Design a protein around this ligand. Structure first.
Ligand SMILES: COC(=O)C[C@](O)(CCCC(C)(C)O)C(=O)O[C@@H]1C(OC)=C[C@]23CCCN2CCc2cc4c(cc2[C@H]13)OCO4
Ligand SMILES: [Mg+2]
Ligand SMILES: [Mg+2]
Ligand SMILES: [Mg+2]
Ligand SMILES: [Mg+2]
Ligand SMILES: [Mg+2]
Ligand SMILES: [Mg+2]
Ligand SMILES: [Mg+2]
Ligand SMILES: [Mg+2]
Ligand SMILES: [Mg+2]
Ligand SMILES: [Mg+2]
Ligand SMILES: [Mg+2]
Ligand SMILES: [Mg+2]
Ligand SMILES: [Mg+2]
Ligand SMILES: [Mg+2]
Ligand SMILES: [Mg+2]
Ligand SMILES: [Mg+2]
Ligand SMILES: [Mg+2]
Ligand SMILES: [Mg+2]
Ligand SMILES: [Mg+2]
Ligand SMILES: [Mg+2]
Ligand SMILES: [Mg+2]
Ligand SMILES: [Mg+2]
Ligand SMILES: [Mg+2]
Ligand SMILES: [Mg+2]
Ligand SMILES: [Mg+2]
Ligand SMILES: [Mg+2]
Ligand SMILES: [Mg+2]
Ligand SMILES: [Mg+2]
Ligand SMILES: [Mg+2]
Ligand SMILES: [Mg+2]
Ligand SMILES: [Mg+2]
Ligand SMILES: [Mg+2]
Ligand SMILES: [Mg+2]
Ligand SMILES: [Mg+2]
Ligand SMILES: [Mg+2]
Ligand SMILES: [Mg+2]
Ligand SMILES: [Mg+2]
Ligand SMILES: [Mg+2]
Ligand SMILES: [Mg+2]
Ligand SMILES: [Mg+2]
Ligand SMILES: [Mg+2]
Ligand SMILES: [Mg+2]
Ligand SMILES: [Mg+2]
Ligand SMILES: [Mg+2]
Ligand SMILES: [Mg+2]
Ligand SMILES: [Mg+2]
Ligand SMILES: [Mg+2]
Ligand SMILES: [Mg+2]
Lengths: 136, 191, 172, 193, 197
RNA sequence: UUUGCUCCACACAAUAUAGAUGGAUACGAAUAAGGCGUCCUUGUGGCGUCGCUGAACCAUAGCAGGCUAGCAACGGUGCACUUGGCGGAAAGGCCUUGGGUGCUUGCUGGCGAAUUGCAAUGUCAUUUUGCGUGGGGAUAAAUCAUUUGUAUACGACUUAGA
RNA sequence: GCAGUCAAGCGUUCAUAGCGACAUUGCUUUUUGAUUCUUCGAUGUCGGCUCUUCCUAUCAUACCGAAGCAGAAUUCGGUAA
RNA sequence: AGAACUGGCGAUGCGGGAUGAACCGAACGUAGAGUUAAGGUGCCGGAAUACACGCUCAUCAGACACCACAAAAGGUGUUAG
RNA sequence: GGCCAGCAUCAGUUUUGGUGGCAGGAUAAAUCCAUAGGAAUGUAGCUUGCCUCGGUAAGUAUUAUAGCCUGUG
């Protein structure tokens, strides 16, 4: 008989919260929340992915579960220093999310022939799995 | 102006373990258990440690914040109800006709039966609510005594009795007759 | 009125024989283009001096660009405004990253809280609140607390197809 | 509510077979002759129906018909009707129903002395009626041109329509009525002087 | 996209559901709406109750028959919402409505067919949290609909069977996933990963 | 009254069509919370993981998909049969058994395709009906007139007649 | 014609229980006016009788709140057609 | 009801203001392509269930000139001063 | 050459994309680099007080075992 009180556990807007930008010339790019302007606006910076330091509406951005050490109001060079240091890029690269983004991005670049090759493969993979799914 | 975070505390006593999923609160103590639905609210409960829970409202207006505190209390009073318990006291009031109060039962019922109110031939009846129990307090003239694990159920069952004894068609400040809630308290004493 | 630039506008009293080299006065002016900005200049100048555009000349018009356009700043704003039944002086504090941004949302705020269209407002001063704890208005003090962090509850993703096969989730 | 099956008894009195027709004398009287064969084989068909009723069914009604020949009338053609069954349990109900096929039910097993009962029937007929007796409207004065068992104002000028709520001439009686609270003062037995 | 789109009413806002359902029809898309008793309307129950009684008083003075008819069933409350969004007195209008069907609960066929949802009409995506709102079933039964309790009964029964279905399904997909995992690492598997699969 | 009716089978013919052209692909509930896997004390339980859209999943190669041969697997699937069971909210459909039979692009072979001429929807769906044939099955009634008066202006209603 | 706002007064005392001056804002369209837009190749004028339906600014009746409501009686106000 | 100046309707369709003599846009030979005005773009209905900051929850909410009405006076509802 | 089409090269009108070279301005303002000063929503270190062997808190403390601001170049 402990107490057991759920949680509900949200990603936060906080300095050094990495965000995936979704509208604009950046878009698909990551970046870091530096300072914090109002309930609806934050200052972001993403030197590594090439996104300009800027003000941005939180609604244009989506919060990732990644965070890393960042002095609030840190300038661009400082951001790029800590970013690297904190290895955020491999960390994100590694996530189901980015993996899913990379996936469909590939599917979209296939070639009519590549597409055809995929089919032949699936027929093959199906043949052996259907067997497996029948023996135990 | 939308307050970015305000929160409250709910203290937890030695014998009880509150537990909350979605927004459904179950509080279980020495005196039994109480459960109450909070889904109509939007606060976020958080256990910090078996003697402490925090409730909070992110980015809220006045009405929203305003309902933070009343959440705190409603779960507070579940916790106290389940430890000390509640006990509402009522006395009869009548300037000539003795109000006679009994407890009848039909079909497992338990009803509070009020007779001779202001003389009335009419027989008054109020249901006994489940969870609340009723003793006609000995050693006190015309005292009825409702008690239970649930404030809201004893407070209401009392108010049910007092109100079934409204006086019509008379100057009700001269005809003060009725059963009135005369003391609000706890069951377990010294406290 | 639009998406503002900020201009230095300089003008002066058409020269004369007996008074060549007249005094020269400047205004900063928040406006969408330099055409509106010169208009505005003459609008206020005839409220302060004996001139009118007819007998005066604009000397220079230059856009003032924000000093540090990616530094979050606390602005205090003074304004004069006309309500339906009389006129009024105000102070607000707005937190954004440029004065130009700030004036964009002032104008929005006057319009929305006081129903004041752009014609009925006079910016008196816009000035960066240097040291915190001179920040007066609580709807700003709020955002200045150390190690600030807040969640964004109840996420709405925008659907792209009319139909969905899921049931959504506002988790976040 | 919707009916999903009707199970019928094997034999059927002519008085009911009467009811299923308009020209009994000329007819070959084939009504229910294939149905009756459903009994033949063991029982199979009718059990499954009875069974189906039992499984589903939120209410059970009984198809009873009257013994009009035991009656002074000339009518010969009996009266068929459904009667709900309010004794316990859907299953016991159909069991009761099945048990009583071709068998007979008496009044004294539905009504008892001093019982309040209701009467449901079609009101006597009067054919086409004037407004005065049909609606109990006031007689018009004797002086009035072109007659007086009428209504003087059939409506105001607006709505420029005669309205549903004013009395008009027309049929009187042959209405369905449901009278309540008629106390039974006697339940008479036929085999009784 | 599909020959027939079955929409689960539950948790949708009447007029937004109506607004999209109308346009779909007019464009040639057959639609069935289900669980219409679990439809929502913004505003507290008492409001939409009064609103209903305003509708309820409009009738042809001389003949309450010819005047406006008041249907009390949630499906049909909904159909009203729709028909108003459709030029229903043109042939093209009648045409589009015939592509439409609304139901309380989920009766046969459609209950083994998948139902979709309509995000731009989903209450939980649309109403600002905190605002009061209404459930059709509750409204309708307050204006005379007879069949709330039965629908509840039948659904709860339906709702039992389908949890069987699901659980049985969930168990087979677990097998399938197990089956898939041995195939992982094989050549064909690594190859398909290359091609985004 | 000129061999009429019906269910199944195919055949000719007509007549249509609010709009086929790989697949309508099934928990429930909550959203200030959930799905899924796993463990256990089976719980408002532990641990793990997922979302950030169906951009999916399934299917998809072969004269609109011909004629053929072989191997590996023992799987997939069409079809008519047969075993047991479920579903009444409009169930009129879903699942399970077993042999038969067709296909298999799981892999490897032989043969065909042109001249429809550089595009012309290039015709592959499903509605309803009509007429013969022969594989099951079935053999009424209503109306007029007559008649009653529980009915009635006339119709209608309600009785009655081998 | 009907309803407010302010509150000097009235009401033994006490502005507002019940009322309310000097002022002042309104509503209504069974008053009467003002108008002259429709009808002068014609829309049957008053009252009553009959009958339907509607409005509510509610007389009665249901349940209430207030009183300078002891009771009884009354008055004021609400939900009410 | 009666004057001043202009622009209109009358004598005039077309697009918009659902509707409408006079408002807004724009003045007309038969047609093709383009672009717009006034006004619009959830669905009726062609056209963003667009973007952005606030505000507002009404047991008779509100919703676009002319226009198809509301006032004094009040609110410890909420917002900014 | 009768009717209708398809494609190619052009012409008139138009609409919707990709892309190259330049001019302004505070010869953009920023970032960046350099340098001087500074402060706090005060980083290290230090002190002090509780505290399950450090973690907290409230003091000092202006780059230290994070950084930021401001001017000048
Ligand atoms: C002063 O009275 C009249 O003028 C009566 C009458 O002559 C009505 C009699 C008409 C016939 C001959 C058809 O009965 C007449 O011309 O009626 C007009 C008339 O006659 C048809 C119609 C008028 C004008 C429009 C409607 N109204 C109603 C009748 C009427 C009654 C009057 C009246 C005028 C009208 C006229 O003035 C006073 O009361
Ligand atoms: Mg009283
Ligand atoms: Mg009295
Ligand atoms: Mg500047
Ligand atoms: Mg059947
Ligand atoms: Mg007579
Ligand atoms: Mg009479
Ligand atoms: Mg009579
Ligand atoms: Mg009469
Ligand atoms: Mg006469
Ligand atoms: Mg058609
Ligand atoms: Mg989880
Ligand atoms: Mg699980
Ligand atoms: Mg768990
Ligand atoms: Mg899927
Ligand atoms: Mg083949
Ligand atoms: Mg159906
Ligand atoms: Mg081959
Ligand atoms: Mg034949
Ligand atoms: Mg005065
Ligand atoms: Mg007094
Ligand atoms: Mg006095
Ligand atoms: Mg009058
Ligand atoms: Mg005239
Ligand atoms: Mg006149
Ligand atoms: Mg006339
Ligand atoms: Mg005339
Ligand atoms: Mg007339
Ligand atoms: Mg009314
Ligand atoms: Mg009233
Ligand atoms: Mg007094
Ligand atoms: Mg009251
Ligand atoms: Mg009435
Ligand atoms: Mg009424
Ligand atoms: Mg003329
Ligand atoms: Mg014109
Ligand atoms: Mg027009
Ligand atoms: Mg209009
Ligand atoms: Mg103009
Ligand atoms: Mg419409
Ligand atoms: Mg459109
Ligand atoms: Mg757009
Ligand atoms: Mg205006
Ligand atoms: Mg006011
Ligand atoms: Mg206010
Ligand atoms: Mg041609
Ligand atoms: Mg060209
Ligand atoms: Mg260029
Ligand atoms: Mg740091």
């Amino acid at each position: 008989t402990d107490s057991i009180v759920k949680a509900s556990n949200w990603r936060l807007v906080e300095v050094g919260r990495v965000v995936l930008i979704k509208k604009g010339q950046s878009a698909g790019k990551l970046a870091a929340i530096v300072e914090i302007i109002d309930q609806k606006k934050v200052l972001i910076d993403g030197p590594k992915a090439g996104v300009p330091r800027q003000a941005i509406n939180l609604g244009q951005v989506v919060l990732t579960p990644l965070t890393f050490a960042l002095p609030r109001g840190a300038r661009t060079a400082t951001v790029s220093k800590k970013w690297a240091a904190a290895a955020v890029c491999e960390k994100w690269a590694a996530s189901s999310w980015a993996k899913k983004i990379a996936q469909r991005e590939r599917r979209a670049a296939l070639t009519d022939f590549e597409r055809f090759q995929v089919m032949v493969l699936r027929k093959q993979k199906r043949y052996t799995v259907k067997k497996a799914l029948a023996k135990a | 102006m939308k307050y970015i975070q305000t929160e409250q505390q709910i203290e937890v006593p030695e014998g009880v373990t509150v537990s909350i999923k979605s927004r459904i609160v179950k509080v279980v103590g020495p005196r039994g258990t109480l459960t109450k639905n909070l889904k109509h609210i939007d606060v976020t409960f958080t256990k910090v440690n078996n003697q402490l829970i925090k409730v909070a409202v992110h980015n809220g207006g006045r009405k929203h914040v305003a309902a933070l505190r009343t959440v705190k209390s409603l779960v507070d009073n579940m916790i106290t109800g389940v430890t000390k318990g509640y006990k509402y006291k009522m006395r009869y009031v009548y300037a000539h006709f003795p109000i006679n109060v009994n407890i009848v039962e039909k079909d497992g019922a338990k009803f509070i039966e009020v007779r001779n109110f202001l003389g009335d031939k009419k027989i008054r009846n109020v249901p006994v609510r489940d969870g609340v129990t009723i003793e006609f307090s000995t050693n006190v003239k015309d005292e009825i005594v409702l008690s239970g694990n649930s404030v809201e159920d004893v407070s209401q069952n009392a108010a049910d009795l007092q109100q079934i004894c409204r006086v019509r068609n008379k100057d009700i400040r001269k005809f003060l007759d009725g059963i009135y809630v005369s003391h609000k308290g706890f069951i377990t004493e010294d406290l | 009125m639009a998406h503002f630039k900020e201009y230095q506008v300089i003008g002066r009293r058409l020269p004369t024989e007996s008074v060549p080299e007249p005094k020269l006065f400047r205004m900063r002016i928040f406006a969408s283009n330099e055409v509106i900005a010169k208009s505005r200049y003459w609008y206020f100048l005839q409220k302060l001096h004996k001139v009118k555009k007819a007998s005066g000349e604009i000397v220079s018009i230059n856009q003032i660009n924000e000093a540090h356009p990616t530094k979050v700043k606390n602005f205090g704003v003074w304004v004069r405004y006309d309500s339906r039944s009389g006129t009024h002086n105000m102070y607000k504090e707005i937190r954004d990253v440029s004065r130009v941004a700030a004036v964009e949302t002032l104008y929005q705020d006057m319009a929305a809280r006081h129903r004041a269209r752009f014609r009925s407002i006079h910016i008196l001063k816009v000035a960066e609140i240097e040291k915190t704890a001179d920040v007066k208005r609580q709807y700003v003090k709020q955002f200045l607390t150390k190690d600030l962090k807040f969640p964004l509850p109840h996420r709405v993703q925008k659907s792209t197809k009319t139909f969905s096969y899921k049931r959504p989730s506002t988790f976040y | 509510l919707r009916s999903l099956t009707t199970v019928w008894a094997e034999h059927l009195s002519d008085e009911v077979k009467r009811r299923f027709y308009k020209n009994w004398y000329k007819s070959k009287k084939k009504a229910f002759t294939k149905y009756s064969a459903k009994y033949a084989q063991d029982g199979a068909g009718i059990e499954r129906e009875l069974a189906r009723i039992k499984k589903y069914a939120s209410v059970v009604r009984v198809l009873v018909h009257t013994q009009i020949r035991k009656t002074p009338l000339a009518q010969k053609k009996a009266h068929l009707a459904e009667i709900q069954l309010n004794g316990g349990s859907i299953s016991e109900k159909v069991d009761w129903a099945r048990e009583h096929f071709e068998k007979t039910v008496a009044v004294d097993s539905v009504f008892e002395q001093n019982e309040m009962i209701d009467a449901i029937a079609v009101t006597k007929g009067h054919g086409f009626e004037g407004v005065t007796h049909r609606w109990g409207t006031k007689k018009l004065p004797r002086k009035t041109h072109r007659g007086l068992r009428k209504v003087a104002c059939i409506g105001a000028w607006h709505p420029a329509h005669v309205m549903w709520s004013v009395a008009r001439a027309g049929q009187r009686g042959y209405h369905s009525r449901t009278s309540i609270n008629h106390k039974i003062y006697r339940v008479g037995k036929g085999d009784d002087e | 996209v599909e020959p027939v789109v079955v929409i689960d009413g539950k948790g949708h806002l009447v007029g937004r559901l109506a607004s999209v359902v109308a346009k779909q029809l007019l464009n040639g898309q057959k639609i069935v709406v289900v669980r219409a008793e679990e439809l929502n309307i913004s505003g507290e129950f008492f409001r939409n109750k009064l609103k209903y009684h305003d509708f309820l008083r409009k009738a042809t003075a001389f003949n309450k028959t010819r005047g406006p008819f008041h249907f009390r069933a949630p499906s049909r409350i909904f159909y009203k919402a729709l028909r108003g969004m459709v030029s229903h007195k043109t042939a093209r209008g009648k045409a589009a409505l015939e592509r439409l069907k609304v139901f309380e609960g989920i009766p046969p066929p459609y209950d083994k067919k998948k139902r979709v949802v309509v995000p731009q009409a989903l209450r939980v995506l649309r109403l600002k949290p905190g605002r009061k709102y209404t459930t059709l079933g509750k409204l309708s039964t307050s204006v005379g609909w007879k069949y709330e309790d039965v629908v509840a009964k039948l659904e709860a029964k339906r709702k039992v069977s389908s949890a069987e279905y699901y659980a049985k399904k969930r168990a087979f997909t677990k097998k399938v996933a197990s089956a898939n995992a041995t195939a992982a690492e094989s050549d064909v598997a690594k190859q398909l990963a290359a091609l985004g699969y």
